Amino acid sequence: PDGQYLLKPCLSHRERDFYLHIKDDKEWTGTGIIPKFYGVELHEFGFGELEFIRMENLMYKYKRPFVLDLKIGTQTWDPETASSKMKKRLVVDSTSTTTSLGVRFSGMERNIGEEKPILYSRYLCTHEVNTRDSLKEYIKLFFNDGKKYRKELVPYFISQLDKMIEVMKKREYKMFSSSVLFVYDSTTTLEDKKYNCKMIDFAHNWILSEEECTVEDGFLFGLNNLKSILEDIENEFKSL
Ligand SMILES: Nc1ncnc2c1ncn2[C@@H]1O[C@H](COP(=O)(O)OP(=O)(O)OP(=O)(O)O)[C@@H](O)[C@H]1O
Ligand SMILES: O=P(O)(O)O[C@@H]1[C@H](O)[C@H](O)[C@@H](OP(=O)(O)O)[C@H](OP(=O)(O)O)[C@H]1O
Ligand SMILES: [Mg+2]
Ligand SMILES: [Mg+2]
């Protein structure tokens, strides 16, 4: 995460279709809930051209990145998932907080000045981060910049989740294996606004006005659960 942009290759139609579909909905593009979308672009690849999505790099100019990926939904497979992945998906969904909370730990990075950064594997989700309490603890740890808890940032994160909930309440799309990405630069001040919370990874988004998706995503359920964990954190951080 060095430069201004992420140029993400389109390996299927779904992500690019989604971004294109919502590119004029100000509820998607004006609310600050997804990365700024610049456009789909062809770039030379192979004998021809490969399509990419150009979007903002949410960590552009971050000095000490803090990154937390939280995968949202009550399942992480959809009607197109390959049978050869399904046993694993079913097991991970059930042994992580996915089926119980609709949200799971997906990985974290903290840069506390002794770099290299401290990396926290997404595989922790089925053991160390397999309960609501342990998930709460790990989010609190994300807010630990190495010297203190950044309690002043939490209202921003809850406010972002509220906007997400507001739009997803409308149930126009289903989204599987998408995440909410939490980031901040620990050298930020509140005024520098080097912190962010966005929905990402729309490679399995279904546009319900153009196609049927029978299975439920539990997306809204997950966002509410995550919001309530943050609100607990906001309380736990008061005694500090
Ligand atoms: N717009 C962005 N700005 C900054 N970092 C990003 C952005 N999008 C993604 N990332 C980083 O890249 C990671 C993976 O992103 P994403 O989920 O979109 O990738 P992917 O290629 O779809 O991989 P997978 O499906 O395996 O998760 C995220 O956890 C996040 O750390
Ligand atoms: O969502 P997509 O686009 O299919 O891609 C999957 C995504 O990268 C998952 O995080 C990964 O699980 P891991 O994090 O365990 O690697 C999975 O591997 P899988 O095929 O082993 O389930 C991939 O198929
Ligand atoms: Mg992803
Ligand atoms: Mg993906």
CATH of the domain at 97: 3.30.470.160
Query: How far is residue 170's CA from residue 31's CA, in Å, rounded to a whole number?
Result: 15
Ligand 1 site residues, Cβ closer than 6 angstroms: 1, 6, 35, 55-59, 67, 69, 179, 181, 200-201, 203
CA dihedral 125, 127, 133, 139 (to 10 degrees): -40
CA of 193 to the centre of ligand 2 (A): 32
Q: Would you tell me the crossing angle of helices 219-236 and 132-142 to the nearest 10 degrees?
A: 60
Query: How far is residue 188's CA from residue 82's CA, in Å, rounded to a whole number?
Result: 43
* Residue pair 135/104 in contact by the 8 Å Cβ criterion: yes
Side by side, the strands of the sheet bearing 48-56 are 5-9, 48-56, 37-45
Q: List helix spans (H) across the chain.
A: 14-22, 26-29, 83-95, 98-101, 132-142, 154-168, 219-236
* Atom number, ligand 2, closest to the C-alpha of residue 81: 4
Residue nearest to atom 28 of ligand 1 (CA): 69
Q: Which of 85, 98, 181 to mutate to test the pocket of ligand 2 (most atoms within 8 A of CB)?
A: 85
The whole-angstrom distance between residue 25's C-alpha and the CA centroid of its chain comes to 20
The tokens describing 25, both together, are 């909905």
User: Any residues with CB less than 8 A from the CB of 79 and at least 6 apart, and which?
Assistant: 213, 214, 215
Three-state secondary-structure class, residue 163: helix
Q: Does the beta carbon of 88 lie inside 6 Å of ligand 2?
A: yes
The tokens describing 222, both together, are 């997950």
Q: Which of 91, 177, 178, 181 to mutate to test the pocket of ligand 2 (most atoms within 8 A of CB)?
A: 177
The tokens describing 48, both together, are 């021809």
Query: How far is residue 124's CA from residue 133's CA, in Å, rounded to a whole number?
Result: 14
Under the phi-then-psi rule, with left for phi > 0, alpha for psi from -120 to 50, and beta for the rest, what region is 2? Answer: alpha
Amino acid identity of residue 141, one-letter, is L
CA of 235 to the centre of ligand 2 (A): 35
- Using only C-alpha atoms, the chain has a radius of gyration, in whole angstroms, of 18
* Atom number, ligand 2, closest to the C-alpha of residue 12: 3
* Atom number, ligand 2, closest to the C-alpha of residue 203: 3
Whether a cis peptide bond, with omega within 30° of 0, leads into 140 is: no
Length of the chain: 240
CA of 8 to the centre of ligand 2 (A): 16
Q: How many CA within 13 A on the CB side of residue 99? A: 10
Partners of 50 in the β-ladder: 43
Q: Measure Cα distances from 111 to 108, 114, 143, 177 in Å.
A: 10, 7, 12, 26
Q: Which of 2, 201, 202 to mutate to test the pocket of ligand 1 (most atoms within 8 A of CB)?
A: 201
Q: Measure Cα distances from 176 to 37, 62, 146, 196, 218 in Å.
A: 20, 29, 33, 21, 9
Query: How far is residue 85's CA from residue 75's CA, in Å, rounded to a whole number?
Result: 13
Number of domains within the chain: 1
DSSP 119-140: EE-GGGGGTTT-SHHHHHHHHH
Residue 96, phi then psi, degrees to nearest 5: -105, -170
Q: Does the beta carbon of 92 lie inside 6 Å of ligand 2?
A: no
Three-state secondary-structure class, residue 153: helix
The whole-angstrom distance between residue 96's C-alpha and the CA centroid of its chain comes to 17
| DSSP letter assigned to residue 36 | P
Residue nearest to atom 3 of ligand 2 (CA): 203
**Structural domain boundaries, residue 30:** 1-240
Query: How far is residue 55's CA from residue 52's CA, in Å, rounded to a whole number?
Result: 10
The tokens describing 107, both together, are 């990985």
